[PDB]
Every structure is written in structure tokens, then in C-alpha cells.
């Protein structure tokens, strides 16, 4: 009814203004709850009518923020769930409760994601090891702070210059006692000679195995490729997107250049061009291993997860 459009408009302008909520798994839970509220607050006879409905609100919700893909791919996963249930019921009226319980299955699958990645983390960390991360990500800090229960090693958390978010990861890892080392972002190739492996997170995994992530991680991947150290992308499968990299150049999220060059700089701000991209593109050849809630996978396998999680008719959404 009307409250449905209230919640939809609140979510849309919440994504338009800022980050609400802060981390992305909460955003996937809100998106799936909003989608189950959408499918329980409408009337339809065919599944295709609900498909156009969900496509319309997905177009609106991804036009709210093109840089954040979790809502769009969650809408796309709900679309594939609807298509699979319509295909298994076609070969009618019991469709709605089946989609509700399938989305509930997806929510129970999704709530135990970071702890499933944490459970398989001990198979990748040995004692007295040098780890380098970038940015701040709750997946990687849960990974490391539970792998530190039985191992003793070293983590070099490199801050990112636009928003020094690696400082929060540093003060969160030092509470667990992992010998946290804080450095700048300019010393990454200066310390790549001693880092044994690089364990980072991401914002969005693309269809070809590539990933957008916090900016400066393409440099980190190049330095780790030069030193041949393996890259561990601790990423869940709601950061899996079928969007190819070269698509209307709407890849990077540019923010106000205040965090790079402040407004009190002078008259030189008029004759200067300051860019602040908070995301960066990493090709799949610079990635060694993905760690998802189903296990470890190669970058030569993400298209298969793509075909297992999304339908090719909904790539345009």
C-alpha cells in the first residue's frame, strides 16, 4: 500500500544521501526484507507481472546509487529465485509462500556468512606470518581476529588516504593482540618485500573475477603481483555482481574533493582539478583466491558462481 512506498522512498533517498546503514551485510538484509515486504504487499496472477514490478523498483533503487551494487544484485538474486520457483511450479497460487520461504532460506544463509568465512580462515594463516590489508572491512577483521585465537602472526594495516579507515581496523585488531602494524598507503611497495600474503576485502566482485574495492588496492595488487605474493579476497557472495567493468564508465565513486584538498587552500582551488575516487578496479589476473561462505574459489570460477546465482536475462535489471 502506501507504507510500502514510504519505506521504498526512505530507502531510496537513504542510498542517495549517504551510507545508511554503515556496513553492507546490513544493507543486504534490509534489501531482502524490503523485497519480501514488496512481494507480500501486492497482487499478481503471473510471475512475470511481479518480475516487471521488481525490475522497476530495482531500476529506481540502483539509480539511487550506481556505485553500491549490493541492493541491485540482491534484487537480481530475488529475481532468479522467483524465476526458479516459477520454473519448478510450471513444469500457481502456492508461489508466494514458496518465495517467502526461499527468501527466508537466503536470509539464514546470509546471516552466517562472516562466521562461515571465519571458520575456514585457519586454513590460510600460519604462525609468525606477515599479512597486509587495506582499508577496513568487517569480513577481514573477523577473519583475522578469530584466526588469532590459535595463531600468532603480523598484520600490516595500510590506511587509505581519502578516508583513513585503516586506523579503525588497526585499533580493532590491536584489541585482539595480533601485532598490528599501521603504515601509510605510500609505503605498500616499500613493505611488499616482507609481506607473506595480502588479505583484503572488496566492495563488489565483477563477473569476470575482477573487483572494485577501496581505492589504492589496485596498487596493492600490483605490488603483490610483482612480489608474487598471493591475494586473499575475503568476500561473501552478495558482493557478486554480473556487471562487467566497461559499462558506461559508472565505475568509480567520486566524492567531494574536500578530503583530499581542503577548502582553505586558497585561490589555487579555482585553477586546480582535484579528484577523489574512493574505489578502484582490480583485474582478475592480480587475484589469487576468493574466500566466500561456500569455500575458496579461483578467479577462473566466478562466472560459474554467476550462473549459479543470477540469470542472464536480468543482467540489465
Amino acid at each position: 500500500g502506501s507504507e510500502l512506498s514510504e519505506r521504498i522512498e526512505s530507502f531510496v533517498e537513504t542510498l542517495k544521501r549517504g551510507g545508511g546503514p554503515r556496513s553492507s551485510e546490513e544493507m543486504a538484509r534490509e534489501t531482502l526484507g524490503l523485497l519480501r515486504q514488496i512481494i507480500t504487499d501486492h497482487r499478481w496472477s503471473n510471475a512475470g507481472e511481479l518480475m516487471e514490478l521488481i525490475r522497476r523498483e530495482g531500476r529506481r533503487m540502483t539509480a539511487a546509487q550506481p556505485s553500491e551494487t549490493t541492493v541491485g544484485n540482491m534484487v537480481r538474486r530475488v529475481l532468479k529465485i522467483i524465476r526458479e520457483e516459477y520454473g519448478r511450479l510450471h513444469g500457481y497460487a502456492q508461489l508466494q509462500s514458496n518465495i517467502i520461504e526461499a527468501i527466508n532460506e537466503l536470509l539464514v544463509e546470509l546471516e552466517g556468512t562472516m562466521e562461515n568465512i571465519a571458520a575456514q580462515a585457519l586454513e590460510h594463516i600460519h604462525s609468525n606470518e606477515v599479512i597486509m590489508t587495506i582499508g577496513f572491512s568487517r569480513t577481514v577483521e573477523a577473519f583475522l581476529k578469530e584466526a588469532a585465537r590459535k595463531r600468532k602472526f603480523h598484520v600490516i594495516v595500510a590506511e587509505c588516504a581519502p578516508f583513513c579507515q585503516g586506523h579503525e581496523m588497526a585499533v580493532n585488531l590491536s584489541k585482539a593482540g595480533i601485532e598490528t602494524t599501521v603504515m601509510t598507503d605510500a609505503a605498500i611497495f616499500a613493505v611488499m618485500s616482507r609481506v607473506n600474503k595480502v588479505i583484503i576485502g572488496t566492495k563488489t566482485i565483477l563477473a569476470n573475477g575482477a573487483l572494485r574495492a577501496v581505492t589504492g588496492t589496485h596498487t596493492l595488487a600490483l605490488a603483490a603481483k610483482h612480489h608474487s605474493t598471493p591475494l586473499i579476497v575475503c568476500a561473501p557472495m552478495f558482493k557478486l555482481s554480473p556487471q562487467f567493468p566497461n559499462e558506461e564508465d559508472s565505475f568509480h565513486k567520486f566524492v567531494a574533493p574536500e578530503e583530499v584538498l581542503p577548502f582553505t587552500e586558497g585561490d589555487i582551488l579555482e585553477k586546480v582539478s582535484v579528484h577523489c575516487p574512493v574505489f578502484d578496479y582490480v583485474p582478475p589476473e592480480l587475484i589469487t583466491l576468493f574466500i566466500s561462505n561456500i569455500g575458496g574459489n579461483a578467479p577462473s570460477y566466478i562466472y560459474r558462481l554467476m550462473s549459479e546465482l543470477y540469470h542472464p536475462d536480468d543482467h540489465v535489471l
Binding site: 563477473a207 562487467f244 566497461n246 564508465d249 577462473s300 562466472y303
Partner: protein, 290 residues
């Protein structure tokens, strides 16, 4: 159609449409042969089609012809035939063949509509030689109001990259005919290299005209994205390791017509099955053959 007509037919099918590929005309010849065979044996047709495909392997020397022959032999023999007197069998087979032909015919347009989203404005496309697929995808790129310069090599054994430049200059796009031995010279200004392949091997590598490997390696040393735009019937069950490991019937004082590009030298593929990484080319190829 005692094989002579078949050869003649194939030719009539290749000369009637100059913008038509060779393997498509081969599959049209196979469909004509099945349509007017006059043999009642669910097996009697397989030997006749194999002989036809070896006459279409002897006439046409392209890799895509034998690939389309295998894909047409698999796609016609897919459904639950269960024929009483072959009448049902032959009719279903003809129906399947026509469906397969239509899928092939709409493949190229799918390729163009799925590929032209990678060309940025003001980009410099590097191209090896004439192929209708890369020309179609460039016409889809100029259909979306994009500006780009194209450097097309000449591909010396038959100056067809010059013919491609003639057909692309009529499109009103800035094209420059570059000598074939200048692909290391112009790689530094060509930001991406789009090359149409004539055969895709199992690992994801491509079989193409002689200058693709040196072009692809020059693209790898300068970190330029090497994109391959090929259809689904150009897949092949081969796995070459070196440039000698391709079969000699596809190659031909030592003037080969075909090289091989390793899948590590290829960034993406643009098939009608989707934009594929080369390990997706291996998975999809095995699945497709079925």
C-alpha cells in the same frame, strides 16, 4: 546431390551473400543435404553427413566449417527421436536445423549489442583484418554516438585489412591502414585491440589469421586489453600448445594462414553465450558440445 552439387551448392551459397560467413553457408549446405537426401535410416544419414562434412572440409579450408559441421551434427540429433519410419525423425531433424540456423543468424547481432559497450569515447581500436563481426560491433559502436579511431593492419597474404579499411571508411569512422609489421609501433597509441577470431580452442585461445599472436603478445607487453569477438559455432575441440600443434589442414616458402593465441594473451571473449573469460570458454565449450 552426389557431392558435386554439394560443392557447387556451397559455392553458390558463399557468392550469393558477400557479407556472409563461411561456416554459416556450410551449415546451410548441410541443411539442404538433409532436406533432400531420400534415405530412411536414422544411421544412414550420419554417414552421409560425415562424408558431406569431409567434402566441406576439403572445399573450405576454414576451421569454422568443421566446427559448424560438428555442432550441426550434434544439434540435429538432440531430441527424443523415437521414429516409426524415419518420417518423424527427418522432419524433427529439419526443424532443429532451421532453429539452429536462425540462432546462428541472430548471433552476430547479439555479439555487437553485447560488445559495443566496451569502446570508450575517443578510444583507439586496433584491428587485425577483415571480419564481419568486428565490423558489425564497430557499426553498433558508431550507432551509439561514439567517436574512436581505428588502426587496421593489412594482413599481407591477402590484403583484406585494406578491404576492411575500405568498408569501415565508408562508415565515416577515422581509420588508418597500418603496415602489418608496425603492430609494435602503433600499440603504444592504440589503447585497446579488438580482433575477430575464426576458431576458438578449448583452453580459451583463439585460432586466427597469421598476425594475431604477435599482435596479442604486443598487447600483453603493453598491458593493453585484447578482446576477441567470435560466435558460438567457431568453437573447436582442439588443444594446441604451440604454433605447430594446430592441425596442418587449418594452417594451409613457409607461409601459414593461421596462427594460435594462448588464452593467457586474451582479456575477454564476446560470444553469443556471453562475455566470457577464457576459463569460461572452456566450461561453456564442453557444456555446449554436450
Amino acid at each position: 546431390m552426389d557431392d558435386k552439387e554439394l560443392i557447387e551448392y556451397f559455392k553458390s551459397q558463399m557468392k550469393e551473400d558477400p557479407d556472409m560467413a563461411s561456416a554459416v553457408a556450410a551449415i546451410r549446405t548441410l541443411l539442404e543435404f538433409l532436406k533432400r537426401d531420400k534415405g530412411e535410416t536414422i544411421q544412414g544419414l550420419r554417414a552421409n553427413l560425415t562424408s558431406a562434412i569431409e567434402t566441406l572440409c576439403g572445399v573450405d579450408s576454414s576451421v569454422a566449417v568443421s566446427s559448424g559441421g560438428e555442432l550441426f551434427l550434434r544439434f540435429i540429433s538432440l531430441a527424443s527421436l523415437e521414429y516409426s519410419d524415419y518420417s518423424k525423425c527427418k522432419k524433427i531433424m529439419i526443424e532443429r536445423g532451421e532453429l539452429f540456423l536462425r540462432r546462428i543468424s541472430l548471433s552476430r547481432n547479439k555479439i555487437a549489442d553485447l560488445c559495443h559497450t566496451f569502446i570508450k569515447d575517443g578510444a583507439t581500436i586496433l584491428t587485425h583484418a577483415y571480419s564481419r563481426v568486428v565490423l558489425r560491433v564497430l557499426e553498433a559502436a558508431v550507432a551509439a554516438k561514439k567517436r574512436f579511431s581505428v588502426y587496421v593492419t593489412e594482413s599481407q597474404p591477402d590484403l583484406s585489412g585494406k578491404k576492411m579499411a575500405k568498408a569501415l571508411c565508408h562508415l565515416n569512422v577515422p581509420v588508418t591502414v597500418v603496415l602489418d609489421a608496425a603492430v609494435g609501433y602503433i600499440m603504444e597509441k592504440a589503447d585497446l585491440v579488438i580482433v575477430g577470431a575464426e576458431g576458438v580452442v578449448e583452453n580459451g585461445g583463439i585460432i586466427n589469421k597469421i598476425g594475431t599472436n604477435q599482435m596479442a603478445v604486443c598487447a600483453k607487453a603493453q598491458n593493453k586489453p585484447f578482446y576477441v569477438v567470435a560466435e558460438s559455432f567457431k568453437f573447436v575441440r582442439l588443444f594446441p600448445l604451440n604454433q605447430q600443434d594446430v592441425p596442418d589442414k587449418f594452417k594451409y616458402e613457409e607461409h601459414p594462414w593461421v596462427d594460435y593465441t594462448a588464452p593467457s594473451l586474451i582479456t575477454l571473449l564476446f560470444t553469443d553465450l556471453g562475455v566470457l573469460t577464457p576459463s569460461a570458454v572452456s566450461d561453456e565449450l564442453i557444456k555446449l558440445y554436450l
